[PDB]
C-alpha cells in the first residue's frame, strides 16, 4: 500500500485505540523518554511502571542521576535484569552533565553518542519528546513492516536491515510523528504479535501482503541454520 495511506490509517487507529496515558507520555521530556526506552528494551510495560516511578521520585533530573553513587543506581535497578543497561544509563547521565550542561542534547549525533543509545533509541527520544522527524526500528516495529511489505530475509544481514530502515523512513510522517511512532510500537506489542497475529483488529489489514496470503510466519526471516 501507498505510504501516505499507511500513515493516515495508523494515525486514525491511534486516535481511537492507542495508549496515551503511560507515565512517560505525560508532561514528556527528553530525560523521561530516554529513561523509559532503556527500561523497556528488555522488560514488559507492567513490570517497568513501578520502577519508572521510583527512579523519577529519587532522581528528578539527569544531574541528580549523574551525581549519585553507581551502587545506589544498581540497587534501585534490582529485578529489571540485563544490568549492562544500568551501567550504561549512569555513564550516559554523566556525559549529559559533563558535555551538555545538564540539559539533554537535541541533535541526532549527540544523542546517539551516548552509551547504551543506538540509532533507533536516538530517533525515539528526539521524535517522541520534541517532535523531530526521525523513524524507529525495534523488534515490534520491524515485524509490522516486514509483514505488511513482505520482507523476507534475516534482519541480521545488513542489506535486509537497510531495506527495513528505508521502509520505516518512507511510511513515517513529519506531521504527527510522536503519535505515529508510539502507534507502531502499540501495534507490534498488542496486535501484530509473534504468534497468531490479531489481523482483524489491525488498521493495515486491507493492504498487508502477509494477511492476504496467510503468510505472517515468513516475515521477518529467521536466522539460517
Ligand atoms: S494485518 Fe496482520 S500480519 Fe499484517 S501488519 Fe496487521 S496484524 Fe501484522
Positive or negative, the CA dihedral 131, 158, 223, 82 is negative
Asked whether 220 lines ligand 1 (CB < 6 A), one says: no
Cβ(9) – ligand 1 distance below 6 Å: no
Could you tell me which of 225, 224, 223, 221 has the C-alpha nearest to residue 153? Answer: 221
Cα of 29 vs its chain's centroid, Å: 15
Owning domain of residue 164: 1-20+133-225
Could you say which DSSP state residue 180 is in?
H
DSSP state of 155: T
Boundary residue ending a domain (106, 132, 158):
132
Residues 31 and 64 sit within 8 Å (Cβ to Cβ): no
Are 119 and 126 in contact, with CB atoms under 8 Å apart?
A: no
Q: How many CA atoms lie within 13 A of 186 on its CB side?
A: 21
43 and 110 fall within a common domain: yes
CA-CA distances (angstroms) from residue 3 to 66, 145, 189?
42, 11, 22
CATH assignment at residue 15: 1.10.1670.10
- Rounded distance between C-alpha atoms, residue 107 and residue 43, angstroms: 27
Is there a binding annotation on residue 148? no
List Cα–Cα distances, 32 to 5, 21, 93, in angstroms: 32, 14, 12
Are both 30 and 121 inside the same structural domain? yes
Looking at residue 191, what DSSP letter applies? Answer: T
Cell numbers for 85, please give them.
543497561
Instruction: List the grid coordinates of 132.
Output: 523531530
- The count of domains in the chain is 2
How many CA atoms are closer than 13 Å to the CA of 192, on its beta-carbon side? 30
DSSP code string of 54-104: HHHHH-SSHHHHHHS-HHHHHHHHTTS--THHHHHHHHHHHHHHHHSTTS-
101 CB-contact burial (10 Å; exposed 0-12 / middle 13-18 / buried 19+): exposed
Distance CA 121, CA 185 (A): 12
C-alpha of residue 174 to centroid of ligand 1, in Å: 23
Elucidation method: X-ray
**What is the structure's resolution, reported in angstroms to one decimal?**
1.4
User: Are residue 110 and residue 72 in the same domain, yes or no?
Assistant: yes
Cα 36 to chain centroid, rounded: 10
CATH code (residue 109): 1.10.340.30
Question: Of the residues 112, 132, 152, which one is the last residue of a structural domain?
Answer: 132
> Are residue 117 and residue 145 in the same domain, yes or no?
no
Give yes or no: residues 9 and 51 share one domain: no
Instruction: Give the three-class secondary structure for 29.
Output: coil
End position of a domain, from candidates 132, 162, 193: 132
Asked whether residue 137 falls in the same domain as residue 126, the answer is no
Decide if 59 contacts 34 (C-beta within 8 A): no
CA of 203 to the centre of ligand 1 (A): 8
C-alpha cell at 73: 543506581
Residue 204, ligand 1, Cβ within 6 A: yes
Amino acid at each position: 500500500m501507498q505510504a501516505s495511506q499507511f500513515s493516515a490509517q495508523v494515525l486514525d487507529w491511534y486516535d481511537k485505540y492507542g495508549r496515551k496515558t503511560l507515565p512517560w507520555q505525560i508532561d514528556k521530556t527528553p530525560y523521561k523518554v530516554w529513561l523509559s526506552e532503556v527500561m523497556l528494551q528488555q522488560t514488559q510495560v507492567a513490570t517497568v511502571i513501578p520502577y519508572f516511578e521510583r527512579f523519577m521520585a529519587r532522581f528528578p533530573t539527569v544531574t541528580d542521576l549523574a551525581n549519585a553513587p553507581l551502587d545506589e543506581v544498581l540497587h534501585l535497578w534490582t529485578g529489571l535484569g540485563y544490568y549492562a543497561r544500568a551501567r550504561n544509563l549512569h555513564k550516559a547521565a554523566q556525559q549529559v552533565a559533563t558535555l551538555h550542561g545538564g540539559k539533554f542534547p537535541e541533535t541526532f549525533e549527540e544523542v546517539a553518542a551516548l552509551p547504551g543509545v543506538g540509532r533507533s533509541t536516538a530517533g525515539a527520544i528526539l521524535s517522541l519528546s520534541l517532535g523531530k522527524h526521525f523513524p524507529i526500528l525495534d523488534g515490534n516495529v520491524q515485524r509490522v513492516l516486514a509483514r505488511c511489505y513482505a520482507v523476507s530475509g534475516w534482519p541480521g544481514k545488513k542489506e535486509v536491515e537497510n531495506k527495513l530502515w528505508s521502509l520505516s523512513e518512507q511510511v513515517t510522517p513529519a506531521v504527527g510523528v510522536e503519535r505515529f511512532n508510539q502507534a507502531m510500537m502499540d501495534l507490534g506489542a498488542m496486535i501484530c504479535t509473534r504468534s497468531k497475529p490479531k489481523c482483524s483488529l489491525c488498521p493495515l489489514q486491507n493492504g498487508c501482503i502477509a494477511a492476504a496470503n496467510n503468510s505472517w510466519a515468513l516475515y521477518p526471516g529467521k536466522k539460517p541454520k
